[PDB]
Structure formats: C-alpha cells, structure tokens
Amino acid sequence: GRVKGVTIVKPIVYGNVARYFGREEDGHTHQWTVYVKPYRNEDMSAYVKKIQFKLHESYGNPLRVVTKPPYEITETGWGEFEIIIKIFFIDPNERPVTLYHLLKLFLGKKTVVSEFYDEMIFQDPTA
C-alpha cells in the first residue's frame, strides 16, 4: 500500500523530561515523562491513531499505548534505557513510524529535558 498523491510533512518533537530525587517505597530516583507532540500545536488526532512506547523489560508491562493527546507516558525509575516510539496512523495504508529515544535522567540541577525534532511524511488525498 503506497500513496498516489500529495505529500504532507508534519514536524514533531519527541523525547522526555525527568525530575530527580523522587525512594523508600521502591528505591526509585526519578520521575519522567516520555512524549511526542507536534512542533507547532495542532490536533494530531486528525491523523495519528495511537502511539506506542516500548519500555525496558524491567518495567512491568513494557508496552504502553496512548490514543488521545497528550501523547505521553509518565513513570518513575532508576535507570536510563532506549525507548522505542511507534506512531500508527488512522489511514490503514499509511505505514507506521518508528522512533528511538534514549531516556535521560541525570551536580546541582534537578530537571532534564532531552528533546528531538523529526518530521512525519504522510501523503494526503489529491483533492
């Protein structure tokens, strides 16, 4: 399935925020949120069906799925690992997009933001 029409570029931003010292219950050191958003705000539900965040196996249930904005997963942990972000489209002939993001957690400052720009190339109907 491959389109026969106009091409659409929708820029996006993906990555995580994390805040430190946040332990007795479970030894965890950080809260973090991993996310995908549009570069400029828009209702990304117009074309995104759902976004999967595949976590490290140390998480119970490493497969996380979000279907409505904001496309984010918040968690606590002790470690950095690579997260696979897979974006699925409403249109069944627009193939999914797979992103990879190294979760960053960590000396005086408490918060970290690791954020990348990308672009989804959809193809639109040729109205």
Handedness of CA 92, 97, 98, 104 (dihedral sign): negative
Instruction: Note whether 105 binds another protein by CB under 8 A.
Output: yes
| # residues near another protein by CB under 8 A | 11
Q: With binding defined as CB under 8 A, does residue 116 bind another protein?
A: no
The answer to the question of residue 81 lying near another protein (CB under 8 A) is: yes
Torsion angles phi and psi, residue 18, rounded to 5 = -150, 145
Binders in 35-64 for another protein, by CB under 8 A: 56-58
Q: How far is the CB of 75 from another protein (least distance, A)?
A: 13
Is position 98 an interface residue for another protein (rule: CB under 8 A)?
Answer: no
Query: Any alpha helices (H) in 13-76, and if so which ranges?
Result: none
User: Which CB atom, from 56 or from 95, has the smaller least distance to another protein?
Assistant: 56
Give least dist CB 84 to another protein, A. Answer: 10
Distances from the Cα of 27 to the Cα of 75, 97, 105, angstroms = 14, 35, 15
Give CA separation, 112 vs 24, 39, 42, 89, 105, in Å. 22, 19, 25, 30, 6
Residues of this chain that bind another protein (CB under 8 A): 29, 56-58, 78-82, 105-106
